[PDB]
Nucleic acid binder design. Structure first.
Ligand SMILES: [K+]
Ligand SMILES: [K+]
Ligand SMILES: [K+]
Ligand SMILES: [K+]
Ligand SMILES: [K+]
Ligand SMILES: [K+]
Ligand SMILES: [K+]
Ligand SMILES: [K+]
Ligand SMILES: [K+]
Ligand SMILES: [K+]
Ligand SMILES: [Mg+2]
Ligand SMILES: [Mg+2]
Length: 1332
RNA sequence: GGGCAAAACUCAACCCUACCCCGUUUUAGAGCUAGAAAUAGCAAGUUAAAAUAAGGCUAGUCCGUUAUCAACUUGAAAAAGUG
DNA sequence: CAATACCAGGGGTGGGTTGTGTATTGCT
DNA sequence: CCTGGTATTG
C-alpha cells in the first residue's frame, strides 16, 4: 500500500507518524523477542522519540584550556626550581621537597613540617617579620643586604606563579605615572591651545580627586567644581571625562555637525579620534594625547594606591597598606564592639556560620557578604564614621588576594622581580647569569598563533618543529619553526574561495577587495538627463573619474555628492536621475583612506607596482594582533617608509575576511579578452557586466575555468554531514535522530519508500540584559541607575526591563514614567500583534497608554515619529533599542506598511525559509530519491514537504483538536501525525504549491495566502464550501469533511502511542567539582592516589555512566561464607574504562566472587522495566528510578482542560466564545472525572500515597474556586503523573514535594524492555529467571 | 516565483588558540591563662605552599567532561544482518 | 529500610564561521 | 534550573 510520514523535530523530541491515503494510522503485529511468553504485540505506527538535550563543546573547551594552563604554570615553577637546584642544594638540601609535600599531614611527611626553614623558631620568626608575602617582596626589592636564597626563591616564585594579565603590550612607560604630573601637563597643553581662556590649576589637588575610590562621574564633578567658570561639558571637562574612562561628546565643543563620542577603551577609538581630528586638525593631537596619558596614570593609581617615592615595589606596598589598615580597623572594631555591643562580639568574631568577621576569615563569607552583615552594626554603633566611609568605598578590612586583582598587569610583577634580581645578583652569581632566563619565565607566553606544543598526538595542534628536542621558553625560537607554524595558523584560520577552492579568501579590508566592491556596485549605475532618450551606463573613463574624484577623496560617497560634485562640475548637468544606488554607496575605500593618512603618499597608493606590497601589508595586519609578528613581517618593506610611518602602520589593525580570492578578482583572465574580472568591472564597453554576469556568461572564459577548478571531495558520512551543518548541536542531534527514525520506518513498511515526508521544526539571561542596560545608560550618560537601584533577577518582569531600557521616558510621549505606577502602564507592540506575532522585546514597547500610539492597524502615526525620532536614535546609539526596533518605530515616515508588506508577512508566517530545515529536507530527499531517468534528472519518488508550526497550530485551534503540553508526551506524536495529514492534503489540493513546499527544482496575495487553508472549513466569513473537497483538475478527492475529521479525532484519541525515552550512557565530569573537607565516609573520593580522603578530603557525588546487573556471590560475616546476590552496581564515569578493560577483575576487586560473566547486563540511564499492572519504571541511576508510564487521558478531558483554562487565546467570535463558555459550564463535572482518572492512574502506577492524599485534600479544599483557576491548577497536577523524574508542584497554594523511588530492588525481578528507536521492535527479558 | 551570489546594516547560533583573577582543599604561621578534667575567659585572624577532574601512553611544556550508543547473530574490531 | 531537606565552581581578555532580516545589483 | 547524591533521622 501507499503511505506518508510526518515528523516533528525538536531539541528533545522527534515525533513520528505514518498515515495512509485515507489519513488513517496503520496498526501492525510486531514480533516480540526474548524469554517471555509473549511472542508478538499490536502497535500503532505513531510515536515520539525523547532524548536529553545535545550539549555544545564550550564547557569541554574551557576545561581543556584550564587544564593546559595549570600544566604550564606548574612547568614555570619547575623551571625556576631547576635554575635554583645546585645552589639551593648547598643552602638547604630539602627545601624544595618540603615545598612539594606541604599538603601532606605530618604523619605522611618525609621531612620536617615547617616548610621554609625546617624548624619552628625560624619559621615563626619569619612570619612575625613578614605577615604577608608582599612584605618579603617589598623588602627584597628595597633592602641592600644579602638575603636567604629560600626567601629569594619564595618571592620570585610568588611573582611567577601569579604573574598578572597580558592586556598591555610593550613596556609600561613609567615616566608618566603621577596623576598630578600629567594633569598639570594637560593643563599646560590646553592653555597652549587657548591663550585667551586659560584654566588656573592652582590649589587643585588632582592626585586625591582623580585617584579617589569614587565613580568616574563623581570624580569628574569633584574636579570641575574646583575650577570656577568651567563646566563639566566644556572642552577641558570633556577631556577629564575622557581620562576618567567616560564617553564624552566633543561635537559641541568644536561646533561640529554630528556626534563625536570618544572612549579610550573602545577598539575603534584610534580611528574615531583621527576621524574627529580631520575636522579640526593636528593642533589638538597632542592635547588628546596628554588626556590619554592622564587616563593611563589614573588606571595605575587605581592599583598602586601607594606613592612611588620611597619604594620601587608599589604593588607590594599597596598590599602592605591594605594589611596595616585592616589591622588598625580590626583592633578598633573589636574595641568598639567591646565598648557598645559586647553582647554580639562572639557572633562577630567566633561564629563562622554567621557572616561576621569570623565567617569572613575562617568561614565562607565574602567581602560583599561581610559588608552587608556588618554595615548596620557599624551604623548602630558610635565612632564608626571612618569605618563606614571605608566600607562604602569597598575598601575595609581587605585581604590581599582578592577578586579585583585581575586588573594587575604583568609588567608590575616584572618590575618587582627584576628589582629583586638586580639586588641579589650582587651576591649570587647564578642569579646574575640567569637574570634574563628568570625574567623570560615570567614574560614568555606561547603565541596565540602556535597552539599546543604537541608532537603528533593532538587533534588541536598545528605546530611544526625545527628540531626534535624539548621546547622551553628559552629555546622557543630555535626549536619551533615559527614561520611554518604561523603559515599553518593562516591556513587553518582563513576560508577558501568557493569559485576557486584552492585559493585563500582576501582580507575584508584588502585594497583590491574594496576596489572590487566599489567597481562592482558602480558598474550597474545608470543616469538620465533631459537630452537623453534612455538611461545609460557609465563608461570606463567615467568610472575611473568618479573613483579618483570622489571615492579617493571622501570615505563615503553620497548620491548628493555624485550629482553635485561630479555631474554638475564635470558633465555640466543642472539635473540628473541616478539608478542603482540610493542615499550613499554601500561600498567604499576605507583602507585607501587609512593608508593615505598613514603613509602620506597618494602617489604610492595609486601605483599599480605597489599592489602586491600593499596587499601583503594588509594581509599581515589582518592575520595577527601581535606586535612582534607584525613588526617581523613588515621588515621587508622597511626601506620604503620612515620610522614615523612605520610606527603608525604597526598600530594599524584590521579584522574580518572577504568571500572571494585574489585570483578570482584580478588573477584569472578571459582567454579571448585577456582581461581579469576587475578589468571588466572597470571597463566593459557599454555592456557593463558585473560579477554574477561575468562568471555566468557563456561568451567568456571565466565560467569554464571555474567549473574546471571546483572539486567535490570525499563525501562525508551522514553523521559527518550533519555535524558540519550550521546550527546548534541540540537541533543537529534531533536531525540525526529524525533520519534514523525515518530509516527504521521505511524498514517497517517492507522497505517501501513513502510518497510524502512532511517535516516540521520547532522555532525554539539576566546578566546579558543587565549588561544591555548597564552599557546603555553609560552611553546615554544618564543617572537613572543612580536614582533607582535594581537587581539582575528583578528583570524577569518585562515591564520593568522595558522601563529601564526606556530611561524613565515614555516611548510615544516625551514624559517621564512613574516607577510605582508601573501596574497601570501598557506594553504595546510596535508592529501590532494582529498583523505579526512578535512578542519579543524587539517588537515591544512600554508606554503610558496604548492610545498615544495613534492608530492601531498601521505603524505608529507620523506625528509620533516626528516627535520621538531623536530620542529613538539616542536609544539606538546606546544599543538599548536595536536597529530593527528603530526602523519599525519610524516606518511611518517611509509610508507605514505597504500592501506587499502585509502579504509578505503572511507568506512568511506560512512558508518556512530557515536554512536548517532546508538542509534537513535536502538530506531526506537525497536519501530517498537516488535514481535518474533517461534525461539523467533526479527521480523524485518521495516528496519532502516542509511546514511551519503555525499551520498545524491554527488547524488545532480551528477544529478543536487542542493540545495541552503538560498532560503527557503524546502531543509530539500528534503534531507529527497532523503534519503528515495537513501537508499531504494541502499539496493534493494545490499542486502548484509544490514550488513553495516541496524540496527540489497587487492585493491578491494578501487574500490568497490568508485563504489557502479555507478548504477545510465548511463555512466562511457567506458561501458554504462543498462537504467533499477535490482537486479541480484531477478530480481526485482530497478531504471529506464528514469523515476525515472523525478519522483525525479517532487517531488523536488512541491510548497506545509509542513513546520512547532514548537510553544514554552518561558522560562528562567525574563528579561534583567541589573539594569537600575531610570526613569519615566511604563516599569521599581521593583527589590524588595517595591522598586518603579521611585525612585530606576529596570529592563525592559521582555520576554513574551506566549500571551493571551482577549475578555473583559475596562473602558474608567473619567466616566469609559465600552468599548469592543479584543487585545493581553503578559503574561511575571514572570507573568505566577500568571496568571495560576487564570487567571480571573489576567486579572481583569490588568484592563479588564467581560472577556469571554472561549474565552481566549493561543498563544505561532510562532503561525501561515493566512490573505489575503495566506499571513501568526507568533507570535514573543504580539506586533511583523514574516514572515510566504515560497517562492516556481521553480527548474529551484534554479539550475541556484547554477551554476551561483559557489556554491560549479566545476565539474572537463572541457567539463562539459564548458557545465554548457554555460547553465548559455544561461539562463542569469533567473536573471530578478528570481527578478520578488521575487518582486511578496514580494508584496503579505512581504509588505516592501521601502525595495523592494531599492532592485530593487540596482539590476538595478549592471546589468553590472559579472553574478557570481549578482547571489551570489541574494542569499542574499532571506533574505527579508525568513520565520521567519526579518533581514538586503546586496545586493552588499547596506545595506537593516529589515522591522519589530511592530503591531499584524491584526491577531486578521485573521485565526489562529493550526498545528500538521507534519502540515498535521490542526485546523483553524476564529478570526473575536470573539468580539462585 | 523557487534556488543562488556579492556588497551594506544587523542581531542569533556555533568552533578554536594563548592567558589572567578568585574559590575550595590539607599543611605551615609555637595560642595564652585557670582547672586533673569537661570547660570558662581572653589573645589572634589578612599570608604561603601544593592540587585543581582519578590519571593515561604516544612521554608531548601532549591528552583526559563535545558528538555518537535498544537488544540479538556474526566478526578481534569498524562493520554488516535479523522481526 | 524508606521519607526529606540541602546542594551543585565563578568572573575577564583574542580570533574564526554560518545564518538572520532588511533592502542594492545581479545569476539560474 | 533539574535532578540525582548525600547525610539526618527515625
Ligand atoms: K574559567
Ligand atoms: K614525620
Ligand atoms: K565650576
Ligand atoms: K571566607
Ligand atoms: K544604500
Ligand atoms: K588582526
Ligand atoms: K555524551
Ligand atoms: K551529557
Ligand atoms: K533505544
Ligand atoms: K554576517
Ligand atoms: Mg593535572
Ligand atoms: Mg589562593
Amino acid at each position: 500500500k501507499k503511505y506518508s510520514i510526518g515528523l516533528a523535530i525538536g531539541t528533545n523530541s522527534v515525533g513520528w507518524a505514518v498515515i495512509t491515503d485515507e489519513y488513517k494510522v496503520p496498526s501492525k503485529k510486531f514480533k516480540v523477542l526474548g524469554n517471555t511468553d509473549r511472542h508478538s504485540i499490536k502497535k500503532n505506527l505513531i510515536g515520539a522519540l525523547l532524548f536529553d538535550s545535545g550539549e555544545t563543546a564550550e564547557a569541554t573547551r574551557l576545561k581543556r584550556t584550564a587544564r593546559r594552563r595549570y600544566t604550564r604554570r606548574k612547568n614555570r615553577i619547575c623551571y625556576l626550581q631547576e635554575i635554583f637546584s645546585n645552589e639551593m642544594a648547598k643552602v638547604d638540601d630539602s627545601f624544595f621537597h618540603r615545598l612539594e609535600e606541604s599538603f601532606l599531614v605530618e604523619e605522611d611527611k618525609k621531612h620536617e613540617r615547617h616548610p621554609i626553614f625546617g624548624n619552628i623558631v625560624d619559621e615563626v620568626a619569619y612570619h612575625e617579620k613578614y605577615p604577608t608575602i608582599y612584605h618579603l617582596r617589598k623588602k627584597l626589592v628595597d633592602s641592600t643586604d644579602k638575603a636567604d636564597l629560600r626567601l629569594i626563591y619564595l618571592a620570585l616564585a610568588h611573582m611567577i606563579k601569579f604573574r598578572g594579565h597580558f592586556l598591555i603590550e610593550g613596556d609600561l612607560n613609567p615616566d608618566n605615572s603621577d596623576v598630578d604630573k600629567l594633569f598639570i601637563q594637560l593643563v599646560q597643553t590646553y592653555n597652549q591651545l587657548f591663550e585667551e581662556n586659560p584654566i588656573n590649576a592652582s590649589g587643585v589637588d588632582a592626585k586625591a580627586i582623580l585617584s579617589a575610590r569614587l565613580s568616574k562621574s563623581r570624580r569628574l564633578e569633584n574636579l570641575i567644581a574646583q575650577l570656577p567658570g568651567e563646566k563639566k561639558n566644556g572642552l577641558f571637562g570633556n577631556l577629564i571625562a575622557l581620562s576618567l574612562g567616560l564617553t564624552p561628546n566633543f561635537k559641541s565643543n568644536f561646533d561640529l555637525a554630528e556626534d563625536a563620542k570618544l572612549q579610550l577603551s573602545k577598539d575603534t577609538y584610534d580611528d574615531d579620534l583621527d576621524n574627529l581630528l580631520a575636522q579640526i586638525g593636528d593642533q589638538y593631537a597632542d592635547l588628546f594625547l596628554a588626556a590619554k596619558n592622564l587616563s593611563d596614570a589614573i588606571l595605575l593609581s587605581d592599583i598602586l594606591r601607594v606613592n612611588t617615592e620611597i619604594t620601587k615595589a608599589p604593588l607590594s606596598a599597596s598590599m602592605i597598606k591594605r594589611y596595616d589598615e585592616h589591622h588598625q580597623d580590626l583592633t578598633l572594631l573589636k574595641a568598639l564592639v567591646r565598648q557598645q555591643l559586647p553582647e554580639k562580639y562572639k557572633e562577630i568574631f567566633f561564629d563562622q556560620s554567621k557572616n561576621g568577621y569570623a565567617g569572613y576569615i575562617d568561614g565562607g563569607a565574602s567581602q560583599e557578604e561581610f559588608y552587608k552583615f556588618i554595615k548596620p552594626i557599624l551604623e548602630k554603633m558610635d565612632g564608626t564614621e571612618e569605618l563606614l566611609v571605608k566600607l562604602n568605598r569597598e575598601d575595609l578590612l581587605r585581604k590581599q588576594r582578592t577578586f579585583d586583582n585581575g586588573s594587575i598587569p604583568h609588567q608590575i610583577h616584572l618590575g618587582e622581580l627584576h628589582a629583586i634580581l638586580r639586588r641579589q645578583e650582587d651576591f649570587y652569581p647564578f642569579l646574575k647569569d640567569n637574570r634574563e632566563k628568570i625574567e623570560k619565565i615570567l614574560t614568555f607566553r606561547i603565541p596565540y598563533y602556535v597552539g599546543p606544543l604537541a608532537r603528533g598526538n593532538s587533534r588541536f595542534a598545528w605546530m611544526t618543529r625545527k628540531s626534535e628536542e624539548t621546547i622551553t621558553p628559552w629555546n622557543f625560537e630555535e626549536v619551533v619553526d615559527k614561520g611554518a607554524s604561523a603559515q599553518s595558523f593562516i591556513e587553518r584560520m582563513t576560508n577558501f574561495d568557493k569559485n576557486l577552492p584552492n585559493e585563500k579568501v582576501l582580507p575584508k579590508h584588502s585594497l583590491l577587495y574594496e576596489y572590487f566592491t566599489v567597481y562592482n556596485e558602480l558598474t550597474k549605475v545608470k543616469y538620465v538627463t533631459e537630452g537623453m532618450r534612455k538611461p545609460a551606463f557609465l563608461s570606463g573613463e567615467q568610472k575611473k573619474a568618479i573613483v579618483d574624484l570622489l571615492f579617493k577623496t571622501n570615505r563615503k560617497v553620497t548620491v548628493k555628492q555624485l550629482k553635485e560634485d561630479y555631474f554638475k562640475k564635470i558633465e555640466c548637468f543642472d539635473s540628473v536621475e541616478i539608478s542603482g544606488v540610493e542615499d550613499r554607496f554601500n561600498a567604499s575605500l576605507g583602507t585607501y583612506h587609512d593608508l593615505l593618512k598613514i603613509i602620506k603618499d597618494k602617489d604610492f597608493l595609486d601605483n599599480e607596482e605597489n599592489e602586491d606590497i600593499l596587499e601583503d601589508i594588509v594581509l599581515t595586519l589582518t592575520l595577527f594582533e601581535d606586535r612582534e609578528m607584525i613588526e617581523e613581517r613588515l621588515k621587508t618593506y622597511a626601506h620604503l617608509f620612515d620610522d614615523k610611518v612605520m610606527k603608525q602602520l604597526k598600530r594599524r589593525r584590521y579584522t574580518g575576511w572577504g568571500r572571494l580570492s585574489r585570483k578570482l578578482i584580478n588573477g584569472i583572465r578571459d582567454k579571448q579578452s585577456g582581461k581579469t574580472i576587475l578589468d571588466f568591472l572597470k571597463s566593459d564597453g557599454f555592456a557593463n557586466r558585473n560579477f554574477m554576469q561575468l562568471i555566468h556568461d557563456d561568451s567568456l572564459t571565466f565560467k569554464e575555468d571555474i567549473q574546471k577548478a571546483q572539486v567535490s571531495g570525499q563525501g562525508d558520512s551522514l553523521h559527518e554531514h550533519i555535524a558540519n551543518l550550521a546550527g546548534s548541536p541540540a537541533i543537529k542531534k534531533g536531525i540525526l535522530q529524525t533520519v534514523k527514525v525515518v530509516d527504521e520506518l521505511v524498514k517497517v513498511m517492507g522497505r517501501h519508500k513513502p510518497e510524502n515526508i512532511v517535516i516540521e521544526m520547532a522555532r525554539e539571561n539576566s546578566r546579558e540584559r543587565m549588561k544591555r542596560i548597564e552599557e546603555g545608560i553609560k552611553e546615554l550618560g544618564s543617572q537613572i541607575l543612580k536614582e533607582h537601584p535594581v537587581e539582575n533577577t528583578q528583570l524577569q518582569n518585562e515591564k520593568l526591563y522595558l522601563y529601564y531600557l526606556q530611561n524613565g521616558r515614555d516611548m510615544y510621549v516625551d514624559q517621564e514614567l512613574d516607577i510605582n505606577r508601573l501596574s497601570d502602564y501598557d506594553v504595546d507592540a510596535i508592529v501590532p500583534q494582529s498583523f505579526l506575532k512578535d512578542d519579543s522585546i524587539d517588537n515591544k514597547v512600554l508606554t503610558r497608554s496604548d492610545k498615544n500610539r495613534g492608530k492601531s492597524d498601521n505603524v505608529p502615526s507620523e506625528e509620533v515619529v516626528k516627535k520621538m525620532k531623536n530620542y529613538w536614535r539616542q536609544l539606538l546609539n546606546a544599543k538599548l533599542i536595536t536597529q530593527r526596533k528603530f526602523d519599525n518605530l519610524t516606518k511611518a515616515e517611509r509610508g507605514g506598511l505597504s500592501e506587499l508588506d502585509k502579504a509578505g508577512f503572511i507568506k512568511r508566517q506560512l512558508v518556512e525559509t530557515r536554512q536548517i530545515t532546508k538542509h534537513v529536507a535536502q538530506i531526506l530527499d537525497s536519501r530517498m530519491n537516488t535514481k535518474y531517468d533517461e534525461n539523467d534528472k533526479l527521480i523524485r519518488e518521495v516528496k519532502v514537504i516542509t511546514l511551519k508550526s503555525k499551520l498545524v497550530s491554527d488547524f488545532r485551534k480551528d477544529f478543536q483538536f487542542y493540545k495541552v503540553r503538560e498532560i503527557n508526551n503524546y502531543h509530539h506524536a500528534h503534531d507529527a501525525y497532523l503534519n503528515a495529514v495537513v501537508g499531504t492534503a494541502l499539496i493534493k489540493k494545490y499542486p502548484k504549491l509544490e514550488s513553495e513546499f516541496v524540496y527540489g527544482d497587487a492585493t491578491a496575495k494578501y487574500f490568497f495566502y490568508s485563504n489557502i487553508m479555507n478548504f477545510f472549513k465548511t463555512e466562511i466569513t457567506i458561501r458554504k464550501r462543498p462537504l467533499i473537497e477535490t482537486n479541480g483538475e484531477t478530480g481526485e478527492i482530497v478531504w471529506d469533511k464528514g469523515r476525515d475529521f472523525a478519522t483525525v479525532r479517532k487517531v488523536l484519541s488512541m491510548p497506545q502511542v509509542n513513546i520512547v525515552k532514548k537510553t544514554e550512557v552518561q558522560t562528562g565530569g567525574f563528579s561534583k567539582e567541589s573539594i569537600l573537607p575531610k570526613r569519615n565516609s566511604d563516599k569521599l573520593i581521593a583527589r590524588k592516589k595517595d591522598w586518603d580522603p579521611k585525612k585530606y578530603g576529596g570529592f563525592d557525588s559521582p555520576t554513574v555512566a551506566y549500571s551493571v546487573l551482577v549475578v555473583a556471590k559475596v562473602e558474608k560475616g567473619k567466616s566469609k561464607k559465600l552468599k548469592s546476590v543479584k543487585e545493581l552496581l553503578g559503574i561511575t564515569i571514572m570507573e568505566r574504562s577500568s571496568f571495560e578493560k576487564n570487567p571480571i577483575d573489576f567486579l572481583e576487586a569490588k568484592g563479588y566472587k564467581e560472577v556469571k560473566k554472561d549474565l552481566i547486563i549493561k543498563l544505561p540511564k532510562y532503561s525501561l522495566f515493566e512490573l505489575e499492572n503495566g506499571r513501568k519504571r526507568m533507570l535514573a541511576s543504580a539506586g533511583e528510578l523514574q516514572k515510566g508510564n504515560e497517562l492516556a487521558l481521553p480527548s474529551k478531558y484534554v479539550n475541556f482542560l484547554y477551554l476551561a483554562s483559557h489556554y491560549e487565546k479566545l476565539k474572537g467570535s463572541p457567539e463562539d466564545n459564548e458557545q465554548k463558555q457554555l460547553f465548559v459550564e455544561q461539562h463542569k463535572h469533567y473536573l471530578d472525572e478528570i481527578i478520578e482518572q488521575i487518582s486511578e492512574f496514580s494508584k496503579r502506577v505512581i504509588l505516592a500515597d501521601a502525595n495523592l492524599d494531599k492532592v485530593l485534600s487540596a482539590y476538595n479544599k478549592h471546589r468553590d474556586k472559579p472553574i478557570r483557576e481549578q482547571a489551570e491548577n489541574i494542569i499542574h497536577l499532571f506533574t505527579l503523573t508525568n513520565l520521567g523524574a519526579p518533581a514538586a508542584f503546586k496545586y493552588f497554594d499547596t506545595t506537593i514535594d516529589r515522591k522519589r523511588y530511592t530503591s531499584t530492588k524491584e526491577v531486578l525481578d521485573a521485565t526489562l524492555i529493550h526498545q528500538s528507536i521507534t519502540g515498535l521492535y521490542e526485546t523483553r527479558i524476564d529478570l526473575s529467571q536470573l539468580g539462585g
